[PDB]
Amino acid sequence: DTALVRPVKTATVSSQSVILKDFSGMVEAVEYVKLAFRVSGQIINLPVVEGQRVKKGQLIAAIDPRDISLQYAADKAAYETAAAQVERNKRLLGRQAISLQEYEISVANYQKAKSAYELSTNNMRDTKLLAPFDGSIETRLVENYQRVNSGEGIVRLVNTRKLRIKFTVPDDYLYLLRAKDATFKVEFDTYKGTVFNARLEEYLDISTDGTGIPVTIIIDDAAFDRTIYDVKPGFTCNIRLASDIAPFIEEKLMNVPLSAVFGDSENKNTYVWIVKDNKVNRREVTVYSPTGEANLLISKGLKPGETVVTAGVYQLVEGQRIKEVK
Amino acid sequence: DTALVRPVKTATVSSQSVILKDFSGMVEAVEYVKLAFRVSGQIINLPVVEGQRVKKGQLIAAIDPRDISLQYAADKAAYETAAAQVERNKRLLGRQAISLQEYEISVANYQKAKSAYELSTNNMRDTKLLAPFDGSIETRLVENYQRVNSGEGIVRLVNTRKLRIKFTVPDDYLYLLRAKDATFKVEFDTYKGTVFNARLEEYLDISTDGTGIPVTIIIDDAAFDRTIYDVKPGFTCNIRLASDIAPFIEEKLMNVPLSAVFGDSENKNTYVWIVKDNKVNRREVTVYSPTGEANLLISKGLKPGETVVTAGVYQLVEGQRIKEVK
């Protein structure tokens, strides 16, 4: 019956002109960026941990702003006094009430005060070390309440904006890489069963050198959640390249093995068994034929002039009598 | 069982590159040759009848040789006397025993006697009218013991050495007539079921004029016995032209409709039913495949990515559970 499970060989229906190739690739190494303060001080906040995913602008660490804050307020006051004194002297010189010498001294003093206040403004901002890009904390190099200098490594942050995959394509497959709208689908060996769309980043094309075509692709798929799919440099994967080498074809033809197609004792129709949820269902198909009824080329087993049955093949046994009908 | 007669549609196995064309043709008219005596006389023998097949040299009619025989014997004697008299005079002149005048008269007399004897020798031979070629007596124009003149029709003899068939081939089929070793097989409408080989006699090739290619062929077959197959001018027939347009092909391929080929539930082999003496017998065939297993192009009924069964198609029913095996 239908409950009797039958072992069957199967195949996937393929578009005549779509070429498919599988390549082995690897997730590219990423350069760890050493994050450091631009000022010296004592860390008073280290709110991130190793493995944490951070966003651009997020706080990594902060130093005690006490001393820098004191210099800032003193440089602020000195700037405000120098600025007020130059504006006053502009008015005094404009009516010739002061010497140019005295005015010049006040301009030079203002730039000195301005430069000092600009430096303290930067030092104040630099008490908070922020993530320069979206990334992950690879390593925490310091401890909280530890004293550090400028340029001293605080954390190692790896950029996670792009997941790059490198593979090499045989030189003879350059036409497949050049085909319009060629697609790339990635399946990671560590996460088999889930396929992700990828886009071309670049490929080195010097087919002349016979050394293969190095290709770089980037994962470009909304389903690629790195909190779920933890892919690291060195991880291997399969890259499926799909190229339609004849997109101009009007009526698209499908490939199926001859052994998939069968007839009916009641008609001249052709069928296949479609496999859906490990069950079969009959499907009527039209075999491509240029003129009239589909014909086969036979390389062995027949001589010209012999007579074969073309209708009624399922209702016959060896040696059975027949009547030829039109 | 095998005794249960099943109606079946069939086809003939055809060689991939052999082109076959059928043309309607007609047996060409033959010119009747009027046979006549070269002498005048009374017919004393008319041994042939209408419809009789005669050979070259065979007697058609004879006139009473009596009078011509009398002239022959008189001209023979006159020639023999004139010949003896000139040989004598050659010897006499050679020793100057006779005048040149007398010798000359005897030479002139000899040629006169010779010419008279040559004419009576021909008239004697011409008392028997013979068939100038192998043919058939279309009409007997005279009766025995009837008196006739020279040139008076005795019989109408039609030449039967060649059976010519004319047909016209469409101009677009010139390449089929030019193909090396193209063959012609004739089947007469009056004698259907028997096919005769024919050879090319000639064809008018001015494809430029767009008026068809008039072709003449001649029956060239030992089985063509005109005593059995009585074919006459105006008789129609079928001309089968067979041309191998790709004789260079190493492994010859045969055409069969797809509907002729079937599998086995126990193996991956392909078969046909061969029809011999209105009975069928299974025949294993090899379907031509360039790389691997034979594939079909499907124009309707499938989408890319669907799964079809390729082995186990005969042991399944609608909705049956399966297990995909490698």
PDB file of N, CA, C and O in Angstrom, chain A residues 2 4 6 8-10 13 254 256 258-259 275 278 280-283 286 288 294 296-301 306-307 310 318-324, chain B residues 2 4 6 8-10 13 254 256 258-259 275 278 280-283 286 288 294 296-301 306-307 310 318-324:
ATOM      1  N   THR A   2       0.326   2.439   0.395  1.00  0.00           N
ATOM      2  CA  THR A   2       1.070   3.699   0.482  1.00  0.00           C
ATOM      3  C   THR A   2       1.990   3.682   1.745  1.00  0.00           C
ATOM      4  O   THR A   2       3.020   4.360   1.768  1.00  0.00           O
ATOM      5  N   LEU A   4       3.704   1.109   2.727  1.00  0.00           N
ATOM      6  CA  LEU A   4       4.873   0.326   2.372  1.00  0.00           C
ATOM      7  C   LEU A   4       5.915   1.282   1.848  1.00  0.00           C
ATOM      8  O   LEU A   4       5.740   1.901   0.796  1.00  0.00           O
ATOM      9  N   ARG A   6       9.158   2.394   0.177  1.00  0.00           N
ATOM     10  CA  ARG A   6       9.957   1.913  -0.928  1.00  0.00           C
ATOM     11  C   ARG A   6      11.227   2.721  -1.051  1.00  0.00           C
ATOM     12  O   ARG A   6      11.144   3.944  -1.119  1.00  0.00           O
ATOM     13  N   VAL A   8      14.055   4.592  -3.064  1.00  0.00           N
ATOM     14  CA  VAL A   8      14.064   5.158  -4.431  1.00  0.00           C
ATOM     15  C   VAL A   8      15.289   6.014  -4.613  1.00  0.00           C
ATOM     16  O   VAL A   8      15.711   6.673  -3.661  1.00  0.00           O
ATOM     17  N   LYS A   9      15.833   6.060  -5.848  1.00  0.00           N
ATOM     18  CA  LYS A   9      16.889   7.025  -6.187  1.00  0.00           C
ATOM     19  C   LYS A   9      16.160   8.246  -6.737  1.00  0.00           C
ATOM     20  O   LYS A   9      15.074   8.107  -7.306  1.00  0.00           O
ATOM     21  N   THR A  10      16.676   9.449  -6.455  1.00  0.00           N
ATOM     22  CA  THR A  10      16.044  10.692  -6.876  1.00  0.00           C
ATOM     23  C   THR A  10      17.072  11.643  -7.472  1.00  0.00           C
ATOM     24  O   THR A  10      18.277  11.446  -7.312  1.00  0.00           O
ATOM     25  N   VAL A  13      15.388  18.616 -10.171  1.00  0.00           N
ATOM     26  CA  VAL A  13      15.097  19.196 -11.501  1.00  0.00           C
ATOM     27  C   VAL A  13      16.047  20.419 -11.657  1.00  0.00           C
ATOM     28  O   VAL A  13      16.148  21.230 -10.731  1.00  0.00           O
ATOM     29  N   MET A 254      13.786  22.258 -18.593  1.00  0.00           N
ATOM     30  CA  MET A 254      14.287  21.585 -17.384  1.00  0.00           C
ATOM     31  C   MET A 254      14.930  20.279 -17.758  1.00  0.00           C
ATOM     32  O   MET A 254      14.471  19.618 -18.702  1.00  0.00           O
ATOM     33  N   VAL A 256      15.762  16.402 -16.717  1.00  0.00           N
ATOM     34  CA  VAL A 256      15.439  15.249 -15.885  1.00  0.00           C
ATOM     35  C   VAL A 256      16.075  14.020 -16.521  1.00  0.00           C
ATOM     36  O   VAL A 256      16.028  13.916 -17.750  1.00  0.00           O
ATOM     37  N   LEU A 258      16.260  10.379 -18.213  1.00  0.00           N
ATOM     38  CA  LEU A 258      15.271   9.615 -18.975  1.00  0.00           C
ATOM     39  C   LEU A 258      14.555   8.611 -18.048  1.00  0.00           C
ATOM     40  O   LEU A 258      13.338   8.453 -18.146  1.00  0.00           O
ATOM     41  N   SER A 259      15.308   7.977 -17.122  1.00  0.00           N
ATOM     42  CA  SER A 259      14.772   6.959 -16.206  1.00  0.00           C
ATOM     43  C   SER A 259      13.674   7.519 -15.248  1.00  0.00           C
ATOM     44  O   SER A 259      12.990   6.747 -14.585  1.00  0.00           O
ATOM     45  N   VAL A 275       8.714  13.938  -5.529  1.00  0.00           N
ATOM     46  CA  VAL A 275       8.943  13.598  -4.131  1.00  0.00           C
ATOM     47  C   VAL A 275       8.739  14.853  -3.283  1.00  0.00           C
ATOM     48  O   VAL A 275       9.503  15.805  -3.400  1.00  0.00           O
ATOM     49  N   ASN A 278       8.816  13.038   1.655  1.00  0.00           N
ATOM     50  CA  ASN A 278       9.108  11.598   1.575  1.00  0.00           C
ATOM     51  C   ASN A 278       7.895  10.750   1.088  1.00  0.00           C
ATOM     52  O   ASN A 278       7.767   9.577   1.464  1.00  0.00           O
ATOM     53  N   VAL A 280       5.428  10.173  -2.809  1.00  0.00           N
ATOM     54  CA  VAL A 280       5.416  10.440  -4.247  1.00  0.00           C
ATOM     55  C   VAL A 280       4.014  10.766  -4.735  1.00  0.00           C
ATOM     56  O   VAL A 280       3.035  10.261  -4.198  1.00  0.00           O
ATOM     57  N   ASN A 281       3.943  11.647  -5.742  1.00  0.00           N
ATOM     58  CA  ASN A 281       2.724  12.075  -6.438  1.00  0.00           C
ATOM     59  C   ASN A 281       3.043  12.221  -7.908  1.00  0.00           C
ATOM     60  O   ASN A 281       4.049  12.848  -8.272  1.00  0.00           O
ATOM     61  N   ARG A 282       2.186  11.636  -8.752  1.00  0.00           N
ATOM     62  CA  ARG A 282       2.385  11.660 -10.195  1.00  0.00           C
ATOM     63  C   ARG A 282       2.198  13.080 -10.760  1.00  0.00           C
ATOM     64  O   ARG A 282       1.305  13.815 -10.344  1.00  0.00           O
ATOM     65  N   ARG A 283       3.083  13.446 -11.691  1.00  0.00           N
ATOM     66  CA  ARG A 283       3.096  14.746 -12.324  1.00  0.00           C
ATOM     67  C   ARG A 283       3.254  14.593 -13.833  1.00  0.00           C
ATOM     68  O   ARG A 283       4.240  14.011 -14.303  1.00  0.00           O
ATOM     69  N   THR A 286       5.722  17.567 -20.228  1.00  0.00           N
ATOM     70  CA  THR A 286       5.833  17.646 -21.674  1.00  0.00           C
ATOM     71  C   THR A 286       7.306  17.562 -21.973  1.00  0.00           C
ATOM     72  O   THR A 286       8.084  18.399 -21.517  1.00  0.00           O
ATOM     73  N   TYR A 288      10.362  18.040 -24.328  1.00  0.00           N
ATOM     74  CA  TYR A 288      10.674  18.941 -25.427  1.00  0.00           C
ATOM     75  C   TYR A 288      10.869  18.163 -26.730  1.00  0.00           C
ATOM     76  O   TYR A 288      11.695  17.238 -26.806  1.00  0.00           O
ATOM     77  N   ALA A 294       8.465  13.243 -29.461  1.00  0.00           N
ATOM     78  CA  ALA A 294       9.857  13.082 -29.017  1.00  0.00           C
ATOM     79  C   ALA A 294      10.454  11.751 -29.514  1.00  0.00           C
ATOM     80  O   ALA A 294       9.804  10.699 -29.431  1.00  0.00           O
ATOM     81  N   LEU A 296      14.249   9.257 -29.732  1.00  0.00           N
ATOM     82  CA  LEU A 296      15.512   8.906 -29.088  1.00  0.00           C
ATOM     83  C   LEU A 296      16.511   8.384 -30.118  1.00  0.00           C
ATOM     84  O   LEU A 296      16.144   7.715 -31.094  1.00  0.00           O
ATOM     85  N   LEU A 297      17.788   8.629 -29.857  1.00  0.00           N
ATOM     86  CA  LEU A 297      18.861   8.062 -30.645  1.00  0.00           C
ATOM     87  C   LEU A 297      19.325   6.834 -29.907  1.00  0.00           C
ATOM     88  O   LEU A 297      19.472   6.880 -28.681  1.00  0.00           O
ATOM     89  N   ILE A 298      19.445   5.719 -30.640  1.00  0.00           N
ATOM     90  CA  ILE A 298      19.840   4.401 -30.168  1.00  0.00           C
ATOM     91  C   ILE A 298      21.186   4.070 -30.763  1.00  0.00           C
ATOM     92  O   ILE A 298      21.342   4.076 -31.990  1.00  0.00           O
ATOM     93  N   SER A 299      22.164   3.782 -29.882  1.00  0.00           N
ATOM     94  CA  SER A 299      23.540   3.472 -30.281  1.00  0.00           C
ATOM     95  C   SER A 299      23.768   1.977 -30.417  1.00  0.00           C
ATOM     96  O   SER A 299      24.700   1.572 -31.108  1.00  0.00           O
ATOM     97  N   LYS A 300      22.919   1.145 -29.786  1.00  0.00           N
ATOM     98  CA  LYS A 300      23.094  -0.314 -29.850  1.00  0.00           C
ATOM     99  C   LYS A 300      21.770  -1.031 -29.651  1.00  0.00           C
ATOM    100  O   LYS A 300      20.923  -0.538 -28.902  1.00  0.00           O
ATOM    101  N   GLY A 301      21.630  -2.198 -30.278  1.00  0.00           N
ATOM    102  CA  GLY A 301      20.465  -3.062 -30.116  1.00  0.00           C
ATOM    103  C   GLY A 301      19.428  -3.102 -31.226  1.00  0.00           C
ATOM    104  O   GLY A 301      18.478  -3.891 -31.143  1.00  0.00           O
ATOM    105  N   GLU A 306      13.872  -2.716 -38.857  1.00  0.00           N
ATOM    106  CA  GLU A 306      13.145  -3.504 -37.855  1.00  0.00           C
ATOM    107  C   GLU A 306      11.900  -2.726 -37.405  1.00  0.00           C
ATOM    108  O   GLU A 306      11.872  -1.497 -37.511  1.00  0.00           O
ATOM    109  N   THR A 307      10.892  -3.435 -36.887  1.00  0.00           N
ATOM    110  CA  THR A 307       9.646  -2.825 -36.436  1.00  0.00           C
ATOM    111  C   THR A 307       9.549  -2.823 -34.905  1.00  0.00           C
ATOM    112  O   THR A 307       9.656  -3.876 -34.279  1.00  0.00           O
ATOM    113  N   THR A 310       5.119   1.360 -30.637  1.00  0.00           N
ATOM    114  CA  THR A 310       5.193   2.751 -30.161  1.00  0.00           C
ATOM    115  C   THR A 310       3.990   3.129 -29.258  1.00  0.00           C
ATOM    116  O   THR A 310       4.007   4.192 -28.640  1.00  0.00           O
ATOM    117  N   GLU A 318       6.161 -11.242 -23.471  1.00  0.00           N
ATOM    118  CA  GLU A 318       7.066 -11.900 -24.413  1.00  0.00           C
ATOM    119  C   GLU A 318       6.318 -12.917 -25.287  1.00  0.00           C
ATOM    120  O   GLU A 318       5.622 -13.776 -24.759  1.00  0.00           O
ATOM    121  N   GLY A 319       6.432 -12.777 -26.599  1.00  0.00           N
ATOM    122  CA  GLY A 319       5.810 -13.684 -27.561  1.00  0.00           C
ATOM    123  C   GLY A 319       4.356 -13.423 -27.895  1.00  0.00           C
ATOM    124  O   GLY A 319       3.787 -14.130 -28.734  1.00  0.00           O
ATOM    125  N   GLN A 320       3.730 -12.418 -27.254  1.00  0.00           N
ATOM    126  CA  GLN A 320       2.303 -12.128 -27.476  1.00  0.00           C
ATOM    127  C   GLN A 320       2.008 -11.713 -28.927  1.00  0.00           C
ATOM    128  O   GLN A 320       2.754 -10.948 -29.526  1.00  0.00           O
ATOM    129  N   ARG A 321       0.910 -12.228 -29.471  1.00  0.00           N
ATOM    130  CA  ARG A 321       0.407 -11.849 -30.782  1.00  0.00           C
ATOM    131  C   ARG A 321      -0.106 -10.407 -30.749  1.00  0.00           C
ATOM    132  O   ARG A 321      -0.711  -9.983 -29.751  1.00  0.00           O
ATOM    133  N   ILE A 322       0.045  -9.686 -31.869  1.00  0.00           N
ATOM    134  CA  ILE A 322      -0.453  -8.321 -31.943  1.00  0.00           C
ATOM    135  C   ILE A 322      -1.188  -8.098 -33.248  1.00  0.00           C
ATOM    136  O   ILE A 322      -1.069  -8.890 -34.187  1.00  0.00           O
ATOM    137  N   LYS A 323      -1.859  -6.942 -33.349  1.00  0.00           N
ATOM    138  CA  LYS A 323      -2.436  -6.485 -34.593  1.00  0.00           C
ATOM    139  C   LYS A 323      -1.960  -5.052 -34.758  1.00  0.00           C
ATOM    140  O   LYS A 323      -2.158  -4.225 -33.860  1.00  0.00           O
ATOM    141  N   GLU A 324      -1.274  -4.773 -35.863  1.00  0.00           N
ATOM    142  CA  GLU A 324      -0.792  -3.431 -36.133  1.00  0.00           C
ATOM    143  C   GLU A 324      -1.978  -2.566 -36.537  1.00  0.00           C
ATOM    144  O   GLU A 324      -2.744  -2.954 -37.423  1.00  0.00           O
TER     145      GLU A 324
ATOM    146  N   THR B   2      -0.465 -15.016 -24.500  1.00  0.00           N
ATOM    147  CA  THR B   2       0.183 -14.659 -25.764  1.00  0.00           C
ATOM    148  C   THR B   2      -0.846 -14.770 -26.935  1.00  0.00           C
ATOM    149  O   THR B   2      -0.703 -14.085 -27.951  1.00  0.00           O
ATOM    150  N   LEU B   4      -3.934 -13.791 -26.755  1.00  0.00           N
ATOM    151  CA  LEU B   4      -4.737 -12.584 -26.709  1.00  0.00           C
ATOM    152  C   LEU B   4      -4.084 -11.572 -27.619  1.00  0.00           C
ATOM    153  O   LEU B   4      -2.974 -11.105 -27.358  1.00  0.00           O
ATOM    154  N   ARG B   6      -3.445  -8.176 -29.232  1.00  0.00           N
ATOM    155  CA  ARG B   6      -3.476  -6.805 -28.776  1.00  0.00           C
ATOM    156  C   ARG B   6      -3.236  -5.860 -29.930  1.00  0.00           C
ATOM    157  O   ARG B   6      -2.243  -6.026 -30.631  1.00  0.00           O
ATOM    158  N   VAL B   8      -1.688  -2.650 -31.618  1.00  0.00           N
ATOM    159  CA  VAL B   8      -0.507  -1.835 -31.258  1.00  0.00           C
ATOM    160  C   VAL B   8      -0.183  -0.892 -32.386  1.00  0.00           C
ATOM    161  O   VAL B   8      -0.355  -1.263 -33.549  1.00  0.00           O
ATOM    162  N   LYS B   9       0.346   0.306 -32.057  1.00  0.00           N
ATOM    163  CA  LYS B   9       0.898   1.208 -33.079  1.00  0.00           C
ATOM    164  C   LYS B   9       2.380   0.861 -33.166  1.00  0.00           C
ATOM    165  O   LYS B   9       2.966   0.420 -32.174  1.00  0.00           O
ATOM    166  N   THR B  10       2.957   0.927 -34.373  1.00  0.00           N
ATOM    167  CA  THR B  10       4.351   0.569 -34.597  1.00  0.00           C
ATOM    168  C   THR B  10       5.044   1.616 -35.456  1.00  0.00           C
ATOM    169  O   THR B  10       4.389   2.450 -36.080  1.00  0.00           O
ATOM    170  N   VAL B  13      12.405   1.233 -37.558  1.00  0.00           N
ATOM    171  CA  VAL B  13      13.680   1.795 -37.060  1.00  0.00           C
ATOM    172  C   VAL B  13      14.363   2.468 -38.286  1.00  0.00           C
ATOM    173  O   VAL B  13      14.432   1.853 -39.355  1.00  0.00           O
ATOM    174  N   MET B 254      20.373   4.981 -34.520  1.00  0.00           N
ATOM    175  CA  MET B 254      19.021   4.666 -35.009  1.00  0.00           C
ATOM    176  C   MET B 254      18.015   5.550 -34.328  1.00  0.00           C
ATOM    177  O   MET B 254      18.194   5.887 -33.147  1.00  0.00           O
ATOM    178  N   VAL B 256      14.212   5.978 -32.857  1.00  0.00           N
ATOM    179  CA  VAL B 256      12.990   5.339 -32.382  1.00  0.00           C
ATOM    180  C   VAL B 256      12.190   6.376 -31.606  1.00  0.00           C
ATOM    181  O   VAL B 256      12.806   7.141 -30.859  1.00  0.00           O
ATOM    182  N   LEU B 258      10.299   8.038 -28.473  1.00  0.00           N
ATOM    183  CA  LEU B 258      10.485   7.869 -27.030  1.00  0.00           C
ATOM    184  C   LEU B 258       9.461   6.852 -26.486  1.00  0.00           C
ATOM    185  O   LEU B 258       9.817   6.012 -25.660  1.00  0.00           O
ATOM    186  N   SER B 259       8.207   6.905 -26.989  1.00  0.00           N
ATOM    187  CA  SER B 259       7.115   6.034 -26.527  1.00  0.00           C
ATOM    188  C   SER B 259       7.392   4.520 -26.792  1.00  0.00           C
ATOM    189  O   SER B 259       6.678   3.670 -26.272  1.00  0.00           O
ATOM    190  N   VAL B 275       8.612  -6.241 -33.347  1.00  0.00           N
ATOM    191  CA  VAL B 275       7.502  -6.923 -34.000  1.00  0.00           C
ATOM    192  C   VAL B 275       8.056  -7.772 -35.144  1.00  0.00           C
ATOM    193  O   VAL B 275       8.578  -7.232 -36.114  1.00  0.00           O
ATOM    194  N   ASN B 278       3.926 -10.661 -36.655  1.00  0.00           N
ATOM    195  CA  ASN B 278       2.778 -10.216 -35.850  1.00  0.00           C
ATOM    196  C   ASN B 278       2.825 -10.721 -34.377  1.00  0.00           C
ATOM    197  O   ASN B 278       1.773 -10.918 -33.755  1.00  0.00           O
ATOM    198  N   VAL B 280       5.396 -10.023 -30.568  1.00  0.00           N
ATOM    199  CA  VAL B 280       6.396  -9.143 -29.966  1.00  0.00           C
ATOM    200  C   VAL B 280       7.399  -9.932 -29.141  1.00  0.00           C
ATOM    201  O   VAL B 280       7.060 -10.957 -28.563  1.00  0.00           O
ATOM    202  N   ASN B 281       8.648  -9.446 -29.130  1.00  0.00           N
ATOM    203  CA  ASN B 281       9.780  -9.975 -28.360  1.00  0.00           C
ATOM    204  C   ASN B 281      10.591  -8.808 -27.846  1.00  0.00           C
ATOM    205  O   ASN B 281      10.919  -7.888 -28.610  1.00  0.00           O
ATOM    206  N   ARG B 282      10.911  -8.847 -26.548  1.00  0.00           N
ATOM    207  CA  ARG B 282      11.658  -7.774 -25.904  1.00  0.00           C
ATOM    208  C   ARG B 282      13.111  -7.723 -26.411  1.00  0.00           C
ATOM    209  O   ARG B 282      13.748  -8.755 -26.610  1.00  0.00           O
ATOM    210  N   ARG B 283      13.596  -6.499 -26.638  1.00  0.00           N
ATOM    211  CA  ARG B 283      14.926  -6.240 -27.141  1.00  0.00           C
ATOM    212  C   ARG B 283      15.589  -5.135 -26.326  1.00  0.00           C
ATOM    213  O   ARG B 283      15.066  -4.016 -26.247  1.00  0.00           O
ATOM    214  N   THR B 286      20.518   0.479 -26.187  1.00  0.00           N
ATOM    215  CA  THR B 286      21.339   1.481 -25.529  1.00  0.00           C
ATOM    216  C   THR B 286      20.928   2.799 -26.130  1.00  0.00           C
ATOM    217  O   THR B 286      21.041   2.996 -27.338  1.00  0.00           O
ATOM    218  N   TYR B 288      21.531   6.568 -26.868  1.00  0.00           N
ATOM    219  CA  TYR B 288      22.712   7.401 -27.032  1.00  0.00           C
ATOM    220  C   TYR B 288      22.775   8.478 -25.947  1.00  0.00           C
ATOM    221  O   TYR B 288      21.829   9.263 -25.770  1.00  0.00           O
ATOM    222  N   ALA B 294      21.388   8.997 -20.010  1.00  0.00           N
ATOM    223  CA  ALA B 294      20.537   9.787 -20.913  1.00  0.00           C
ATOM    224  C   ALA B 294      19.596  10.718 -20.123  1.00  0.00           C
ATOM    225  O   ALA B 294      18.978  10.298 -19.135  1.00  0.00           O
ATOM    226  N   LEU B 296      16.509  14.034 -20.504  1.00  0.00           N
ATOM    227  CA  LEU B 296      15.449  14.621 -21.320  1.00  0.00           C
ATOM    228  C   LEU B 296      15.275  16.100 -20.988  1.00  0.00           C
ATOM    229  O   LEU B 296      15.434  16.528 -19.836  1.00  0.00           O
ATOM    230  N   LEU B 297      14.874  16.872 -21.990  1.00  0.00           N
ATOM    231  CA  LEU B 297      14.507  18.258 -21.798  1.00  0.00           C
ATOM    232  C   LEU B 297      13.007  18.284 -21.661  1.00  0.00           C
ATOM    233  O   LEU B 297      12.314  17.604 -22.425  1.00  0.00           O
ATOM    234  N   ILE B 298      12.525  18.979 -20.621  1.00  0.00           N
ATOM    235  CA  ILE B 298      11.128  19.134 -20.246  1.00  0.00           C
ATOM    236  C   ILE B 298      10.739  20.575 -20.460  1.00  0.00           C
ATOM    237  O   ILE B 298      11.367  21.479 -19.897  1.00  0.00           O
ATOM    238  N   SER B 299       9.695  20.787 -21.285  1.00  0.00           N
ATOM    239  CA  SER B 299       9.202  22.122 -21.634  1.00  0.00           C
ATOM    240  C   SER B 299       8.065  22.562 -20.730  1.00  0.00           C
ATOM    241  O   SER B 299       7.817  23.760 -20.615  1.00  0.00           O
ATOM    242  N   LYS B 300       7.381  21.614 -20.064  1.00  0.00           N
ATOM    243  CA  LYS B 300       6.250  21.962 -19.190  1.00  0.00           C
ATOM    244  C   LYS B 300       6.055  20.918 -18.105  1.00  0.00           C
ATOM    245  O   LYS B 300       6.310  19.736 -18.353  1.00  0.00           O
ATOM    246  N   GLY B 301       5.566  21.354 -16.946  1.00  0.00           N
ATOM    247  CA  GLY B 301       5.225  20.470 -15.835  1.00  0.00           C
ATOM    248  C   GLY B 301       6.168  20.401 -14.645  1.00  0.00           C
ATOM    249  O   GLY B 301       5.854  19.722 -13.658  1.00  0.00           O
ATOM    250  N   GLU B 306      12.603  21.035  -7.757  1.00  0.00           N
ATOM    251  CA  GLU B 306      11.705  19.936  -7.384  1.00  0.00           C
ATOM    252  C   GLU B 306      12.478  18.611  -7.436  1.00  0.00           C
ATOM    253  O   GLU B 306      13.478  18.509  -8.152  1.00  0.00           O
ATOM    254  N   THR B 307      12.004  17.600  -6.700  1.00  0.00           N
ATOM    255  CA  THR B 307      12.650  16.293  -6.643  1.00  0.00           C
ATOM    256  C   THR B 307      11.840  15.237  -7.407  1.00  0.00           C
ATOM    257  O   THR B 307      10.659  15.043  -7.125  1.00  0.00           O
ATOM    258  N   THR B 310      14.191   8.641  -9.917  1.00  0.00           N
ATOM    259  CA  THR B 310      14.957   8.225 -11.103  1.00  0.00           C
ATOM    260  C   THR B 310      15.162   6.689 -11.163  1.00  0.00           C
ATOM    261  O   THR B 310      15.621   6.178 -12.183  1.00  0.00           O
ATOM    262  N   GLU B 318       0.319   6.350  -6.232  1.00  0.00           N
ATOM    263  CA  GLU B 318       0.027   7.718  -5.808  1.00  0.00           C
ATOM    264  C   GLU B 318      -0.002   7.834  -4.277  1.00  0.00           C
ATOM    265  O   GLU B 318      -0.704   7.071  -3.624  1.00  0.00           O
ATOM    266  N   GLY B 319       0.790   8.745  -3.731  1.00  0.00           N
ATOM    267  CA  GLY B 319       0.849   8.999  -2.293  1.00  0.00           C
ATOM    268  C   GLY B 319       1.736   8.079  -1.480  1.00  0.00           C
ATOM    269  O   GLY B 319       1.861   8.270  -0.265  1.00  0.00           O
ATOM    270  N   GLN B 320       2.361   7.073  -2.120  1.00  0.00           N
ATOM    271  CA  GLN B 320       3.199   6.099  -1.399  1.00  0.00           C
ATOM    272  C   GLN B 320       4.416   6.757  -0.729  1.00  0.00           C
ATOM    273  O   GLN B 320       5.069   7.614  -1.312  1.00  0.00           O
ATOM    274  N   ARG B 321       4.708   6.334   0.497  1.00  0.00           N
ATOM    275  CA  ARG B 321       5.894   6.747   1.231  1.00  0.00           C
ATOM    276  C   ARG B 321       7.147   6.165   0.572  1.00  0.00           C
ATOM    277  O   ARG B 321       7.127   5.015   0.102  1.00  0.00           O
ATOM    278  N   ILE B 322       8.259   6.910   0.624  1.00  0.00           N
ATOM    279  CA  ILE B 322       9.508   6.417   0.063  1.00  0.00           C
ATOM    280  C   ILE B 322      10.653   6.669   1.021  1.00  0.00           C
ATOM    281  O   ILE B 322      10.529   7.457   1.964  1.00  0.00           O
ATOM    282  N   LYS B 323      11.817   6.087   0.704  1.00  0.00           N
ATOM    283  CA  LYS B 323      13.050   6.392   1.393  1.00  0.00           C
ATOM    284  C   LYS B 323      14.064   6.686   0.299  1.00  0.00           C
ATOM    285  O   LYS B 323      14.263   5.862  -0.600  1.00  0.00           O
ATOM    286  N   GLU B 324      14.647   7.881   0.330  1.00  0.00           N
ATOM    287  CA  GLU B 324      15.646   8.259  -0.652  1.00  0.00           C
ATOM    288  C   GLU B 324      16.937   7.515  -0.337  1.00  0.00           C
ATOM    289  O   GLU B 324      17.397   7.549   0.807  1.00  0.00           O
TER     290      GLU B 324
END
